[PDB]
Protein: Tetratricopeptide repeat domain protein
Amino acid sequence: EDPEDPFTRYALAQEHLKHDNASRALALFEELVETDPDYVGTYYHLGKLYERLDRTDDAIDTYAQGIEVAREEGTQKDLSELQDAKLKAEGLEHHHHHH
Structure:
């Protein structure tokens, strides 16, 4: 187990969230997207973190990317959660746009 492995650094990013180092967790999840666009588990947790930081628009984008890889690469479990997490984010700022 190295913090370079996708699941390990993902789980470690969750630990950074718990230590209030949300900024360090943010960088981990954002890198997880750019390097491993396949890893659906990132997109959920990164978007949730975006909503915390009032980056709700960025969250919508991350969930949408997640949806594509959830339906093809992930499972229906992933797909439903990402579609759900964005539809509530559409109503946070209530300034959501047509994707």
